């Protein structure tokens, strides 16, 4: 019986990989031939955020577009005012090993986990005074990769036990489980309505997950390694993944296979984040080289090099109106470039 | 100046922050950090043990005015390479490996756990993390293998073992080919001590070792060596 | 008129030595461009090591200078130009072995206080830096002051005909007390190394004692013969030691110092080549 | 049996997966494209904002 | 909750010295900068002196500097101020406030209910005028408090540093907008500030009971901070 059901689950993989054929007449690269290359993209270093002791593991801005959230090593979340390198907040982490965090976007909460597997998220607006830790979540039995706030109640986590998990704020409880990745969940991305969300694990596979239902939507299987960074486009209907094979993989939900891919002969390193602009139209991808690449996601090509880091960038953050591009590397410095 | 009341309320606020992640970051820098790494069942929790009397766990001691973290990360089923350089930098790492199971072959396989354990301290040892960081390897249960290794020959874990089925010399071959799987003889040191559940120089041979990495340390700050 | 009376009352191979000196200016660039390449040597032991660069390509600089201004063209120069010249030899040659206490200072800090990480502190980092120029250029600056052989003709050096012996036997006093505080610092960074690695029970101080003993050996080799000169100078007297005219090789062998100085603190820093070779 | 209800869960999940409408790439590419030139000029990053409105200068 | 008690005053021969202490419970003492403002018997609000977080900072209303001193002790959580050479003019009812500055912050968010002192018997600073001194109001009405300022307290940052404060008989002052524009947490929604540039005002929609009172307009924007003469309501 074992021996049937995996031939019946390899006849539908044919009959998938069939019907993704069938819908493939024209490649991206193709379409986007004609249109006026982008030209070479000169961005500045504007704000250095020094105050950090160990290396940057995490970024988020916020949809203020002015505060921003930076996690270290040292056991730091430092709430930075990006447009005057002032610290609003530095709260003291009660596990030293961070490396996600998040900004909840009415601003009244920040996120933050690790290899604790507890998601902390901790009260900014508080009549005290101080910061407080709201609440700590408990259930994964990895370590905590990603965090993204869907509001100031839930928040959906994926860890390193091949699970992501949405979880009611208030009451503490994961509200729903996400199963079927084979690896380590690296990244996770949220949808513009809040609706769906990608996930990248290392099983060199990407999942389109339904946020209400809790069932898996979507497979999309183009990497040949681990899926480090995962950020989906501002209409929401495509998505991008970084991974450690060197090389960047636009994926489409509607046409449900790959679209384009980034990659170029003199880059061997890894890819920790990625992000978009606001328009979409340049890729944004953090390298292990020390520099941070900036694609043409039309295109393909290579349109910048933001070298500014002496030591890896392991966070990217773009503004939620693209005044800004946040980048935070292990040399413990966060720069803001325009 | 340019910046209102508020503003430069705001920016003395700020340096006050400053002023307190300097003093943290001060304390912070002063104190030790030791990664413990292991096998199953390879003796970390019994050095946990000794530490403490004289996700990831960390244990928090002190000896001759040395602050130690020991950072245990037992129980994190995932991928090493993932979250293994977050421990970049550490001070040292702890390396446990038991004797006894030289001829236990239940891995989980068909594999003894001595391999496996030798198998796991290559790819500690030499990986592009911890080319600098030196190791300081616990050999635990000498009574229990001593008791073992007489009527279980070394042969079923190591074929071309030819030497007598003695204490002293099989140890000091289990120890050789440990050390052996050091490629980056010059950049780090090995630090063997062999332990078991009834003795208390453990922590007094993490300080010595401890002190002798940061002599070395000192001494490649300061161009010296 | 006062030089000449001075030649005439004290009794007073270049082309080789300017290729040595080059050789000097050529080394101290090469490891100056060395430390502000590599991003990870921005600490205050390579600052150190790079302000002793400095004073180097510094004393080889006015040592070409003199060399070129040395000879029968020094009736020429005014004594001012004179005095300028002497403090300049004299201001680079300061610095050069101020630079050599302030390395042996911080690394005495470093070893007496083992710490984990070592702070980068710029406060003492840069007393230590302004000092080193400061004492240079004012030691240098006492003989313009009017501490000179003016109305102290018959107490006037030999070598530096229009320098009084009293300068000299305070800059020889000077460098007796800097000489001294270097080698004492040293052998009590090898002392502590040595009880502290005794003290542990289970190499570095061997390696230790030879770049020790190199150091200290190439250094006292090289200013020897420069302070048993400018000791004899004022305990001689006038139009009697013929051998202060021959003071050239002296002067070769204490800026030679300052050429040997990188291949030292390069060679003996294995991190220092690595970096040297990419 | 829990390899066998685990491969009949991997095949309804396939099954499932394979049951969505697919449009063609050329549809999806002509999409993306459209969205992109029609946020074009919204985007501070492709063209460089002028100093005078900009928040870091 | 929190709450600052005042403590300390009372009748005192004029030119003694008296000591009034703040003592603050409920919220991180050493994070706020504190201020103390006196009230007049039968007039409006007055700045007196502030001390930063720290102790940092430290600042004097012109009419008390040199005869006053203000400090605070953190680790037991208390604001001292120590009067000397008291005048006449000193006969007042002393408040501290706490006061936190950073980006989105509500400085002045809470009052004390402060403590009397009695006594027996300029130029350069921005003025805030409230010419209406009172009007007569009908409860589930709409009333618009308007404020005056000499100079602009818009900054080139786009803030208009004006607060507004609203004093029921018997109650301490508390805020309701600050930055002219934003509500203080627990203040209902009636309550609107707009304004720009010099003049201000204060929208009430549908008020009731509780909403009769002082108001006061304050300007943060130059340190001597200045409060308004006030504008009372009375219900018909
Ligand atoms: C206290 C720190 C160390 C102190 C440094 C003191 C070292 C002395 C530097 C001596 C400078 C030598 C330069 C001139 C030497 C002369 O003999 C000739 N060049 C000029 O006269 P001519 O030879 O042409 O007749």
Known sequence: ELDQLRQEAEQLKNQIRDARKACADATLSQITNNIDPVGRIQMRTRRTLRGHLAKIYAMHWGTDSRLLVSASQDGKLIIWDSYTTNKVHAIPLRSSWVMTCAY???????????????????????????????????????????????????????????????????????????????????????????????????????????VRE??????????????????????????????????????????????????????????????????????????????????????????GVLAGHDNRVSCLGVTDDGMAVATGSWDSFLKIWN | ?????????????????????????????????????????SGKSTIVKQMKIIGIVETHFTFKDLHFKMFDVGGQRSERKKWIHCFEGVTAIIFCVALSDYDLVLAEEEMNRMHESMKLFDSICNNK???????????????????????????????????????????????????????????????????????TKNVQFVFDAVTDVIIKNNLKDCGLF | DIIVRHYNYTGKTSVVFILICCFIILENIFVLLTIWKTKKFHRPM?????????????????????????????????????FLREGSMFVALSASVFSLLAIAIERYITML????????????????????????????????????????????STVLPLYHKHYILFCTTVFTLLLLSIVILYCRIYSLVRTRSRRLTFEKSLALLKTVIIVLSVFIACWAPLFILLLLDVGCKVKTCDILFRAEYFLVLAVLNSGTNPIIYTLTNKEMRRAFIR | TASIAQARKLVEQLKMEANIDRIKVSKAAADLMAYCEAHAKEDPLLTPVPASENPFR | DVQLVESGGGLVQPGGSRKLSCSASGFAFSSFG????????????????????????????????????????????????????????????????????YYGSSPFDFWGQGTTLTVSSGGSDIVMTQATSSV????????????????????????????????????????????????????????SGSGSGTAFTLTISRLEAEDVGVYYCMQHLEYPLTFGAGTKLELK
């Not at chain 1, 199963?179 to 309505?193: F, I, K, N, Q, R």
């Not at chain 2, 000091?172 to 003889?185: G, H, M």
């Not at chain 3, 400095?54 to 040592?63: I, K, R």
């Not at chain 5, 907008?177 to 203040?187: C, E, F, T, W």
Request: a negative charge; proline letters at 3%.
């Open chain 2, 129 to 199: 993390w911890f080319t600098d960081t030196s190791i300081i390897l616990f050999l635990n249960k000498k009574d229990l293998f001593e008791e073992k290794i007489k009527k279980s020959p070394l042969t079923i874990c190591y074929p071309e073992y030819a030497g007598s089925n003695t204490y002293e010399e099989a140890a000091a071959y289990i120890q050789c080919q440990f050390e052996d799987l050091n490629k980056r003889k010059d950049t780090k040191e090995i630090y063997t001590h062999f332990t078991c559940a009834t003795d």
């Open chain 1, 104 to 210: 909840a976007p009415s601003g009244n909460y920040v996120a933050c986990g690790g290899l604790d597997n507890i998601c902390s998220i901790y009260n900014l607006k508080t009549r005290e005074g101080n910061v407080r830790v709201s609440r700590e979540l408990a259930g994964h039995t990895g370590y905590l990769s990603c965090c993204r706030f869907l509001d100031d109640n839930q928040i959906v986590t994926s860890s390193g036990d091949t699970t992501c998990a949405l979880w009611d704020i208030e009451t503490g409880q994961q509200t729903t489980t996400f199963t079927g990745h084979t690896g380590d969940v690296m990244s996770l991305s949220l949808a513009p309505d809040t609706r769906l969300f990608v996930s990248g694990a290392c099983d060199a596979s990407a999942k389109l997950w339904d």
């Open chain 5, 136 to 191: 007569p109001v009908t409860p589930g009405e709409s009333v618009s408090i308007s404020c005056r300022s000499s100079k602009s307290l818009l900054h080139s940052n786009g803030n208009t540093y004006l607060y507004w404060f609203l004093q029921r008989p018997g109650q301490s002052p508390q805020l309701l907008i600050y930055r002219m524009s934003n509500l203080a947490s627990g203040v209902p929604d009636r309550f």
């Open chain 3, 113 to 156: 206080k083992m710490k984990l990480h070592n702070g980068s502190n710029n406060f003492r980092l840069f007393l230590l830096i302004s000092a080193c120029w400061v004492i240079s250029l004012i030691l240098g600056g006492l003989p313009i002051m009017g501490w000179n052989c003016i109305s102290a003709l018959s107490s006037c």
């Open chain 2, 1 to 41: 100046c340019t910046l209102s009341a508020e503003d430069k309320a705001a920016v003395e606020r700020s340096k006050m922050i400053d002023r307190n992640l300097r003093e943290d970051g001060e304390k912070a820098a002063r104190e030790v950090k030791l990664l413990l790494l292991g096998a199953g069942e």
């Open chain 3, 46 to 82: 390579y600052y150190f090591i790079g302000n002793l660069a400095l004073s180097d390509l510094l004393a080889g600089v006015a040592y070409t200078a003199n060399l070129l201004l040395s000879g029968a063209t020094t009736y020429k120069l005014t004594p001012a130009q004179w």
């Open chain 1, 214 to 303: 809790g069932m898996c939507r979507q497979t999309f299987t183009g990497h040949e390694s681990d899926i480090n960074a995962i950020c989906f486009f501002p209409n929401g209907n495509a998505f991008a993944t970084g991974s450690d094979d060197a090389t960047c993989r636009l994926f489409d939900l509607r046409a449900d296979q790959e679209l384009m891919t980034y990659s170029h002969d003199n880059i061997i390193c890894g890819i920790t984040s990625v992000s978009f602009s606001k328009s979409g139209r340049l890729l944004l991808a953090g390298y292990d080289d020390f520099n941070c690449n900036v694609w043409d996601a039309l295109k393909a090509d290579r349109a």
């Open chain 5, 34 to 101: 504190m201020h103390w403002v006196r009230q007049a018997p039968e007039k409006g609000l007055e700045w007196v002196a502030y001390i930063s977080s720290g102790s940092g900072t430290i600042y004097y209303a012109d009419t008390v500097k040199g005869r006053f001193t203000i400090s605070r002790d953190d680790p037991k959580n208390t604001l001292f101020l120590q009067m000397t050479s008291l005048r006449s003019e000193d006969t007042a009812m002393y408040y501290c406030v706490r006061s936190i500055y």
